[PDB]
Amino acid sequence: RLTAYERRKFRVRNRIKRTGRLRLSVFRSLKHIYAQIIDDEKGVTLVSASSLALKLKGNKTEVARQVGRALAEKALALGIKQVAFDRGPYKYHGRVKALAEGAREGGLEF
Amino acid sequence: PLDVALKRKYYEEVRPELIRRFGYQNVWEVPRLEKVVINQGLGEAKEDARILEKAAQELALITGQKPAVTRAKKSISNFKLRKGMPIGLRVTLRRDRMWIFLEKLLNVALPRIRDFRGLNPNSFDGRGNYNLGLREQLIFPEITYDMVDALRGMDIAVVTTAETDEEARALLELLGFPFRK
Amino acid sequence: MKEGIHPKLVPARIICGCGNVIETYSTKPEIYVEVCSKCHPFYTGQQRFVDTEGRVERFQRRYGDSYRK
Amino acid sequence: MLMPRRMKYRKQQRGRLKGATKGGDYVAFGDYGLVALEPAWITAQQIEAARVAMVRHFRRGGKIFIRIFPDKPYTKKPLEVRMGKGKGNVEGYVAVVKPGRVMFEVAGVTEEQAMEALRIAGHKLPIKTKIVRRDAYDEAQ
Amino acid sequence: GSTRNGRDSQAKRLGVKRYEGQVVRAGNILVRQRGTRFKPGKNVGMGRDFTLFALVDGVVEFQDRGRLGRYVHVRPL
Amino acid sequence: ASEVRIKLLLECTECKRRNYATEKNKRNTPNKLELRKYCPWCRKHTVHREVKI
RNA sequence: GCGGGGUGGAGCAGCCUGGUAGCUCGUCGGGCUCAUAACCCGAAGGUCGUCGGUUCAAAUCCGGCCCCCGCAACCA
RNA sequence: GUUCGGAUUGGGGUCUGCAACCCGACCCCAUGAAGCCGGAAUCGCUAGUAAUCGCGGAUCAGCCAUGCCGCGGUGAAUAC
RNA sequence: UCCCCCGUGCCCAUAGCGGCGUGGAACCACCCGUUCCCAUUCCGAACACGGAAGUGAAACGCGCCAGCGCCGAUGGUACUGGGCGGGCGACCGCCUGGGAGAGUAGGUCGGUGCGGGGGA
RNA sequence: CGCCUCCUAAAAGGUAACGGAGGCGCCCAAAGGUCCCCUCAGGCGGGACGGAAAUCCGCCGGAGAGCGCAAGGGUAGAAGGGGGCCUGACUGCGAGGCCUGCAAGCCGAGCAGGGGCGAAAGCCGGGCCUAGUGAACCGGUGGUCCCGUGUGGAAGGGCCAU
RNA sequence: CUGACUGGGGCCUGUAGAGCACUGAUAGGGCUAGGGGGCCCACCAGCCUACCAAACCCUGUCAAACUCCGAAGGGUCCCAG
Ligand SMILES: [Mg+2]
Ligand SMILES: [Mg+2]
Ligand SMILES: [Mg+2]
Ligand SMILES: [Mg+2]
Ligand SMILES: [Mg+2]
Ligand SMILES: [Mg+2]
Ligand SMILES: [Mg+2]
Ligand SMILES: [Mg+2]
Ligand SMILES: [Mg+2]
Ligand SMILES: [Mg+2]
Ligand SMILES: [Mg+2]
Ligand SMILES: [Mg+2]
Ligand SMILES: [Mg+2]
Ligand SMILES: [Mg+2]
Ligand SMILES: [Mg+2]
Ligand SMILES: [Mg+2]
Ligand SMILES: [Mg+2]
Ligand SMILES: [Mg+2]
Ligand SMILES: [Mg+2]
Ligand SMILES: [Mg+2]
Ligand SMILES: [Mg+2]
Ligand SMILES: [Mg+2]
Ligand SMILES: [Mg+2]
Ligand SMILES: [Mg+2]
Ligand SMILES: [Mg+2]
Ligand SMILES: [Mg+2]
Ligand SMILES: [Mg+2]
Ligand SMILES: [Mg+2]
Ligand SMILES: [Mg+2]
Ligand SMILES: [Mg+2]
Ligand SMILES: [Mg+2]
Ligand SMILES: [Mg+2]
Ligand SMILES: [Mg+2]
Ligand SMILES: [Mg+2]
Ligand SMILES: [Mg+2]
Ligand SMILES: [Mg+2]
Ligand SMILES: [Mg+2]
Ligand SMILES: [Mg+2]
Ligand SMILES: [Mg+2]
Ligand SMILES: [Mg+2]
Ligand SMILES: [Mg+2]
Ligand SMILES: [Mg+2]
Ligand SMILES: [Mg+2]
Ligand SMILES: [Mg+2]
Ligand SMILES: [Mg+2]
Ligand SMILES: [Mg+2]
Ligand SMILES: [Mg+2]
Ligand SMILES: [Mg+2]
Ligand SMILES: [Mg+2]
Ligand SMILES: [Mg+2]
Ligand SMILES: [Mg+2]
Ligand SMILES: [Mg+2]
Ligand SMILES: [Mg+2]
Ligand SMILES: [Mg+2]
Ligand SMILES: [Mg+2]
Ligand SMILES: [Mg+2]
Ligand SMILES: [Mg+2]
Ligand SMILES: [Mg+2]
Ligand SMILES: [Mg+2]
Ligand SMILES: [Mg+2]
Ligand SMILES: [Mg+2]
Ligand SMILES: [Mg+2]
Ligand SMILES: [Mg+2]
Ligand SMILES: [Mg+2]
Ligand SMILES: [Mg+2]
Ligand SMILES: [Mg+2]
Ligand SMILES: [Mg+2]
Ligand SMILES: [Mg+2]
Ligand SMILES: [Mg+2]
Ligand SMILES: [Mg+2]
Ligand SMILES: [Mg+2]
Ligand SMILES: [Mg+2]
Ligand SMILES: [Mg+2]
Ligand SMILES: [Mg+2]
Ligand SMILES: [Mg+2]
Ligand SMILES: [Mg+2]
Ligand SMILES: [Mg+2]
Ligand SMILES: [Mg+2]
Ligand SMILES: [Mg+2]
Ligand SMILES: [Mg+2]
Ligand SMILES: [Mg+2]
Ligand SMILES: [Mg+2]
Ligand SMILES: [Mg+2]
Ligand SMILES: [Mg+2]
Ligand SMILES: [Mg+2]
Ligand SMILES: [Mg+2]
Ligand SMILES: [Mg+2]
Ligand SMILES: [Mg+2]
Ligand SMILES: [Mg+2]
Ligand SMILES: [Mg+2]
Ligand SMILES: [Mg+2]
Ligand SMILES: [Mg+2]
Ligand SMILES: [Mg+2]
Ligand SMILES: [Mg+2]
Ligand SMILES: [Mg+2]
Ligand SMILES: [Mg+2]
Ligand SMILES: [Mg+2]
Ligand SMILES: [Mg+2]
Ligand SMILES: [Mg+2]
Ligand SMILES: [Mg+2]
Ligand SMILES: [Mg+2]
Ligand SMILES: [Mg+2]
Ligand SMILES: [Mg+2]
Ligand SMILES: [Mg+2]
Ligand SMILES: [Mg+2]
Ligand SMILES: [Mg+2]
Ligand SMILES: [Mg+2]
Ligand SMILES: [Mg+2]
Ligand SMILES: [Mg+2]
Ligand SMILES: [Mg+2]
Ligand SMILES: [Mg+2]
Ligand SMILES: [Mg+2]
Ligand SMILES: [Mg+2]
Ligand SMILES: [Mg+2]
Ligand SMILES: [Mg+2]
Ligand SMILES: [Mg+2]
Ligand SMILES: [Mg+2]
Ligand SMILES: [Mg+2]
Ligand SMILES: [Mg+2]
Ligand SMILES: [Mg+2]
Ligand SMILES: [Mg+2]
Ligand SMILES: [Mg+2]
Ligand SMILES: [Mg+2]
Ligand SMILES: [Mg+2]
Ligand SMILES: [Mg+2]
Ligand SMILES: [Zn+2]
Ligand SMILES: [Zn+2]
């Protein structure tokens, strides 16, 4: 018996894989926000970034934009440029939208 | 947020006495109110005068909250019902507006009721929830004899966080519900 | 909440005919009621209004013991 | 007599009668049984004849178990017509019975009472039969 | 005597068109089906009538992923 | 296609040529169809209008 | 074998085009008459041959079985 | 459908009578029905009459009398 | 390289239902608010934001139990590719190679990849 | 008597009979594109008028509902339900294949023009799918400005569309 | 040298057989709505049922247009004779 959270999750994630891109999946908890870029062909994570690993400050929204500029920064160093955004169960808005835009300024392509 | 009598009374008198009688080991284990849903299964407005802004204007005054429509799930011959036809109203009260409504309900409404002999003890869910009916919306204070065209009562559903009828019964009586038997 | 669809809530003065006044909130600042929780027959313990009847019938006739034995 | 009260389809292809029974091959209810030695379509008319015969021996007493049921519809073209113009009409119902099935079992009766009704029953059938009583082998299935 | 029956439809010649380990070109049809008996996997398109066909030159592979259904893939050569 | 479900054409409202043909239910949709479609003549999109077939 | 049919008690509508059962007589209660008829005033009664299905809903559309009318059954 | 109308019933009392269950009248509290002027049809009355109003008497313990036999008050329309 | 938790996959119920027990430092959750972004055919329930007083009550994670569900041999049989017999038939046998399903024994209250966070 | 579904059909495809059963000769301006959100039938309990069945609350319920219409296949990790903006129910093409005697029928990635939705990855050349159909001849209609019987026009034809 | 046939290997399938989980059928038993029947009532509930009988459970079975299962075979592609 699935839940709206679970179904919505598959619902967007399934459409992302099919386009074959590297996925910039984003996790957003009550305090923190994590993001890892995954190659689903190997079941393997290639680069990560999280607020909790960066020990970042207060405002969740700016925190997101900063973990975003971070993820890109480590990313372009591995040649990763093209990638696709996994908004998971999270509406593209607020904290998640902010991380996305951070990744963009960083130069990651999407 | 709002300080109101029943909301206050819940934490102050209802909460402790409940912890007494059933001895919970966690604050969240103890019975709470989640929501009171009000309903008007109406359907007298199926065809006829499907203008029921008069009752949506009514329910909006009673609860300080705009009701939503309910529409037919399936068409019915014997009821003369097209699928999707507008046949009722439903407003869901949570938090402050929930208390304020129950507050006026317990202190005013049930008293004004024709030959009131106490709420039905047996209208208990089995899973600790409670439902009751009203024959008239005049039963409330905010609806004068003047502003009404016709008698229209309602369904009232109150959801608890309880698991049994017994904790539910206590939570509600402790709040101020008058039961006959 | 949404704006422009919602009646506005204000501190309200419900008055009863016993002279109970209730401090609450409502869409109307002042209301009078005919009856309340503070005075109702079923409500006030067991104030059995007009009839503390005990029936009285049917043993109760007793008019009288004057029929003979 | 026996016949399905309703069915998804009116007419059924004829099929085959190869092999021993798929099941129904062990005593299950009564004390004694009548088992089919060779394959056949046993008609309702025979099952009822066989049944009635058995109750007719017992008079008052016993219990009769019918383990076969005529669910296969039997078709015949109307007399004197030529081939073609569709499938015949359903005229009766049959029980498809292979070698080794119990068709009838009896209970609550002396052994000679049972040997005899099962025998008399057996004459009413279009096949050879063997009478068997319940063994631990039956018990063990 | 007459029949109220008599009719049937043209057969549609459905089923798998290319089996596992067979080399296909981009465009080749792989499976013809009514509904998703098989699902498109890597390098496999699906047409408006459910027809699975190859998106790249390469080699067919099947995969039975339980409750996730059966999949057809093409592996680049 | 029927008596009520008619066939029709769409005329480019700018160059007046018919580039697309379709159908409608004239009871369900009594007004003339209006749609933007690529007109091959003007080489862009144009509001196209239902015209007699 | 092909076409048509079964609706208060009698005889016909309504079915095609699904929602709504109608007409004449008859029955019953009242009136005129000494009385009956006629005539006048009111009123009851069909759950539509069945069983199944389609539908939101079937007298109505579709299937099964039943009974009735008509026509056919030829070269042989 | 009312301060119209007063049936129906609930509750409580008075009286007559040996006795008011079936089955009396009357008084009081409450209940407050049908009925918005009557289908086909049909009755009475020609003047102090019809219509309307009250009073008495016979029978008779009481009374189901709104019946009957009388009595006065007011008092018409119309007959080509 | 080991333990716990947060992510995200793979295997596709040996992973599930139920029952009992356990975890809040950390992470996660509920939670505290509804100013702001955003939101309710009504409702800050959901989605969303700003938060960190409390609580592991719900959820989740981790263990335990075989009542249900799920998996399930060995053996034997049915059936059968090919090769031969028998019967008037319905049908029935032998040889060689293949071999179920049911049922029985029994197994199961998950295993594993990658990246993070913490601990030894 | 053509077309679709199931069985017969002997586990590839195909397969006959006056064998067994049913459907089609439509439909939808949204019942289409896309973005976002949502999850059913049914059972038990509870609720004014309220019923077996209207609408409301809770718990159980993997799909037994729904998907216009027959059946099968498919399907909630949506193809089902709601909303917003929209017209790709495109123009010019088409690598490569399914099927197949012919002629037909079908699926289709991708390049270009000019668009729609989306932050984007991307999707979109009607519809969950398989029926809803008719080759050519003759002619009608809109456009094109190709031929125009000595020449300029015209008549009439060709081409694209219907 | 690519052929019929043959060896190994992968993928495809829903028949034989079997099964009752779905669609239907189905004999007996248990349990049990609904009616019928017999007591008692019209004050509305009750009690008994060697009666007909839903849904559920058990035992036991049937099916071209049923399948939780499911062969031997068969089709196709690669390498080899
Ligand atoms: Mg892996
Ligand atoms: Mg209860
Ligand atoms: Mg009021
Ligand atoms: Mg509760
Ligand atoms: Mg045959
Ligand atoms: Mg025979
Ligand atoms: Mg036959
Ligand atoms: Mg005949
Ligand atoms: Mg024949
Ligand atoms: Mg025949
Ligand atoms: Mg026969
Ligand atoms: Mg047998
Ligand atoms: Mg014999
Ligand atoms: Mg067995
Ligand atoms: Mg005939
Ligand atoms: Mg015919
Ligand atoms: Mg046929
Ligand atoms: Mg054929
Ligand atoms: Mg064919
Ligand atoms: Mg076919
Ligand atoms: Mg296939
Ligand atoms: Mg497509
Ligand atoms: Mg499609
Ligand atoms: Mg493989
Ligand atoms: Mg692969
Ligand atoms: Mg008649
Ligand atoms: Mg007609
Ligand atoms: Mg009509
Ligand atoms: Mg009469
Ligand atoms: Mg007469
Ligand atoms: Mg229906
Ligand atoms: Mg009707
Ligand atoms: Mg019917
Ligand atoms: Mg019906
Ligand atoms: Mg009929
Ligand atoms: Mg004749
Ligand atoms: Mg009145
Ligand atoms: Mg009396
Ligand atoms: Mg009055
Ligand atoms: Mg009246
Ligand atoms: Mg008046
Ligand atoms: Mg008068
Ligand atoms: Mg008068
Ligand atoms: Mg007259
Ligand atoms: Mg005179
Ligand atoms: Mg006197
Ligand atoms: Mg007197
Ligand atoms: Mg009297
Ligand atoms: Mg008098
Ligand atoms: Mg995890
Ligand atoms: Mg894992
Ligand atoms: Mg568990
Ligand atoms: Mg604990
Ligand atoms: Mg736990
Ligand atoms: Mg904590
Ligand atoms: Mg702590
Ligand atoms: Mg706080
Ligand atoms: Mg605000
Ligand atoms: Mg602010
Ligand atoms: Mg909140
Ligand atoms: Mg817990
Ligand atoms: Mg969660
Ligand atoms: Mg164990
Ligand atoms: Mg298995
Ligand atoms: Mg097994
Ligand atoms: Mg074995
Ligand atoms: Mg052989
Ligand atoms: Mg053999
Ligand atoms: Mg062998
Ligand atoms: Mg062997
Ligand atoms: Mg097998
Ligand atoms: Mg086995
Ligand atoms: Mg387990
Ligand atoms: Mg790990
Ligand atoms: Mg680590
Ligand atoms: Mg045709
Ligand atoms: Mg076939
Ligand atoms: Mg086949
Ligand atoms: Mg085949
Ligand atoms: Mg082929
Ligand atoms: Mg036909
Ligand atoms: Mg829409
Ligand atoms: Mg659609
Ligand atoms: Mg839309
Ligand atoms: Mg429900
Ligand atoms: Mg209910
Ligand atoms: Mg009710
Ligand atoms: Mg209801
Ligand atoms: Mg379905
Ligand atoms: Mg726009
Ligand atoms: Mg080609
Ligand atoms: Mg061809
Ligand atoms: Mg075709
Ligand atoms: Mg574009
Ligand atoms: Mg844009
Ligand atoms: Mg394209
Ligand atoms: Mg559609
Ligand atoms: Mg279509
Ligand atoms: Mg076509
Ligand atoms: Mg010609
Ligand atoms: Mg010709
Ligand atoms: Mg022409
Ligand atoms: Mg020229
Ligand atoms: Mg010239
Ligand atoms: Mg000139
Ligand atoms: Mg010229
Ligand atoms: Mg000119
Ligand atoms: Mg021209
Ligand atoms: Mg010209
Ligand atoms: Mg053309
Ligand atoms: Mg060679
Ligand atoms: Mg070869
Ligand atoms: Mg070869
Ligand atoms: Mg070979
Ligand atoms: Mg078989
Ligand atoms: Mg079954
Ligand atoms: Mg079993
Ligand atoms: Mg068979
Ligand atoms: Mg079959
Ligand atoms: Mg079979
Ligand atoms: Mg094989
Ligand atoms: Mg074959
Ligand atoms: Mg082979
Ligand atoms: Mg092979
Ligand atoms: Mg070779
Ligand atoms: Zn008061
Ligand atoms: Zn144009």
PDB file of C-alpha atoms (C1' of nucleotides) in Angstrom, chain B residues 75-77, chain G residues 19 56-57:
ATOM      1  CA  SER B  75     -25.803   8.932 -11.067  1.00  0.00           C
ATOM      2  CA  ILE B  76     -28.916   7.654  -9.344  1.00  0.00           C
ATOM      3  CA  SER B  77     -32.314   7.038 -10.949  1.00  0.00           C
TER       4      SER B  77
ATOM      5  C1'   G G  19     -37.649   8.438 -17.597  1.00  0.00           C
ATOM      6  C1'   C G  56     -27.999   5.914 -13.917  1.00  0.00           C
ATOM      7  C1'   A G  57     -33.205   4.076 -15.064  1.00  0.00           C
TER       8        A G  57
END
